[PDB]
Each structure stands twice: as C-alpha cells, then as structure tokens.
C-alpha cells in the first residue's frame, strides 16, 4: 500500500493516507562554547605588512567580542502572540 488517497465526492475533500509521524514533543538544551582570549591592545611600531594583517584580524576578533558583549543585556525576545 504505502501512500494512498481517497477522494470524497460528496464533501469535495481528499485524504492522503500512509504517512508516519515524527512529532516534536520535548527539547534538548545543549551549551555550545567558544574559548577565547583576553589580550589587551598591545602597542608596537611593527610597520610590517604580515603584522598589520594580524593586527587587522585581531581588531576583528576584539570588536566581535565587544559586539557579542553588547548583544547581551537584556535577555531574549521572542515576538510571541499567535
């Protein structure tokens, strides 16, 4: 059998049969972590191009942390009422 269908002429409706459920009932809460570092604006003359790229990516990491830090406070949303 598997997928089968029946059309009811009298009601203008059709039922598709043969399916199996996988209904979400519960939830599994996992804590995903990223271990980061706490360097401080180091100061160096280092005019080297290889260093300035490392300086450029290090600023990106530092700003990301500051962004995520500002992202906290307050607690989540979640746009309810439907």
């Amino acid at each position: 059998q598997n997928i089968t269908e029946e059309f009811y002429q009298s009601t203008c409706s059709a039922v598709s049969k043969g399916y199996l459920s996988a209904l979400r009932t519960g939830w599994y809460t996992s804590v995903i972590t990223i271990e980061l570092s706490n360097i401080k604006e180091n100061k160096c003359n280092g005019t080297d191009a290889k260093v300035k790229l490392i300086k450029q990516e290090l600023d990106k990491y530092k700003n990301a942390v500051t962004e995520l830090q500002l992202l906290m406070q307050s607690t989540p949303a979640t746009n309810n009422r439907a």
């Binding site: 039922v15 199996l20 996988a22 939830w27 180091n42 990516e57």
Partner: protein, 373 residues
Amino acid sequence: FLGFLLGVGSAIASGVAVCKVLHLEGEVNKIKSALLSTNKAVVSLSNGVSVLTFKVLDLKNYIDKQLLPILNKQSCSISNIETVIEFQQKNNRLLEITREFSVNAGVTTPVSTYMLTNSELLSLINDMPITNDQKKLMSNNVQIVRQQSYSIMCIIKEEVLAYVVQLPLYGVIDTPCWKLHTSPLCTTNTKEGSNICLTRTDRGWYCDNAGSVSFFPQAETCKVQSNRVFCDTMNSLTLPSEVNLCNVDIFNPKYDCKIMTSKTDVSSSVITSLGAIVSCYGKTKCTASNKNRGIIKTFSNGCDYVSNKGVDTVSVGNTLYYVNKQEGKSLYVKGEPIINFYDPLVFPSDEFDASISQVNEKINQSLAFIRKS
C-alpha cells in the same frame, strides 16, 4: 484554515532558563573546567539539568600560544603569512556567529552550520539520552533537525562564549498520519450568481497521538520526507479520534464537522499527494492534461478529482498546476454532493467558521418563522 484556534507558547523558554542558570553564581567556571580535558562533556547544572557541553573552536590556545609572543613586545620582528591565513580561517567562525546574532537579536532558527556543524550536530545527536532508533531518525534528517532547532546567545562571562543550541525531541514516532485537502462545494445553477457554497474547514495534517488525534491546521507548518511527517505539537490542536468521521460521514452525530458557507462560486484546484481536486464553477476552463498527449479530461461545473496517473498538469482558468508524480493508488468515492441537500433560500450563506449542526439550527430557526408567522 483553523489556524487562529491555536494556543500560544514561547519556543525558547526552556533554552532561556538555561541562560539564567549559566549566568549565576558562577557556573561558567564549572563548565570551563569540564571542557579542559575534552572538547565534549556532559555536565549537571545546579538546576540539575544534565546538559551536553561542547568546546567547538578554542581561540584562547591559538591567540595565547601562536599570536601572543609576536605582540608582547617591543618590536613585532617575527611574522609569517601561513599564520595570518590560519588565524583568518580560525577567527571567521566567531565572526560569522557574531554576524548571525547581530541581525537575529541573539536568537537564530534554523541553527546554521557556523552555529553547529554537521559533524558537531551528528555527534551531539549520538551523545543525547535518546533511543537507538531516535538517534538514527535525527541523523538521517539533520536538515529538518536544523530547521526545528533554535540557537540562543547566552553570555561571554570570563574568557568564554556560550550560546545554547535547543534541539527537538520526537516523543511521537511512527504513528499514522494523514493529510486532509478540502476545496469549496457549490451548486452549479446556470444563473449569474444565486449559488450556495460549503467548504470543509478542517484541512490540514492529522496524526494519531496518545489516543486523540493531533491536528495541524496550517499543513504549511509541517516538514515532510517521503512517508515521514515532522511536526511541532505547538502548531496542533488535540481532537477526539471521532474527527475522522467527517471524512466517511459528515452528518454523523459523534462529531460536529467544521464547515464554512459562502455564495463564492470561485474556480480553483488543490494539488493533493496523489492527484488533484478541481472546484470548477461559472464559465471557467478546467482541464487535466498529459505533456505529450494534451487535454485528457475536461472538468464539468462542480467539484471533481483526477488521479496523477498519466496526468502531469491541471489548468483552472489562467492557472497551471503541476500534479505530484508520486507512486500510489487513489480512490474515487462517488457520493451526492452535500450542498444539494440544502434549500437555497433559508440556507445560511455567510458562516465563516461554522459546523454542520450550527448550519442546521440556523436552517430550522429561519424555517420556523416562515411557517409559524
């Protein structure tokens, strides 16, 4: 249709409560310790929630052990690009997770690859306290698990970034589901309008679940693979099993079948799993065709059906529908259209969210006044 009938709840409410606990007093160090020896570890919260913890990406041991000697000077004399590329690569994920949270105000769905990769996710599933079979199901439908999951930003306390990934649990598996497709049923009189309609409002997914039937009014919310129907019970109503009586007998006493009434003589088609329902009214061209052969059936006024076997397309007016090409048998159950049982005058034409008996009470009420007066 019946979507407005659903209740309300907060999906992230459980994952939010894990954030509350992760803040106090402190608990961040409790998990930092546990994730020093291994990249993955089970941890029991003071709350007592046994939560699987993962150290995906360790930027500390890379910046401290590979970038720190260069900047704790002086002069940045030594440097190499094979390290600039390695860092750009390593950092990117944090940058991409930060991007995602910045637009989704700290709560993402579906859970992205940057949030949790396939290898990380498949490992998370395989380390969950769930059935051997339940592990297989989730692993074989990761694409769905991602769409049904949430990623909640939590905190950056002491040297650590924590976000909660909230994954589905399927408490109901392998129970029979069925999809009810409904279309408008109208009288087919040769007049301008003056026709009466009726439509079953109960369209949606139905699953047997704990002795009752879980009804998904907006069938658009469920994800389907093959046989498999993935639903969220929050988007359901839990009805008596007698709701299935409306199919075989809409006039049954056991259940008051949800219908709506109109004088809206409008043409349309509904593409089902194995065919097509055609509601053909007025001067509309309603047809079913095969690619090579052309028109194979011309629908008359009224509500009809055509099976997908040898039909690729259905055209209702200026609209073309592609029929689903799934292998399966369909059954035409001949019956007198329910709308013919109604006297047009004295029939209540504007019931938006009614049922059979509601309509029948209204019919008597109106009928009585004509007879008694």
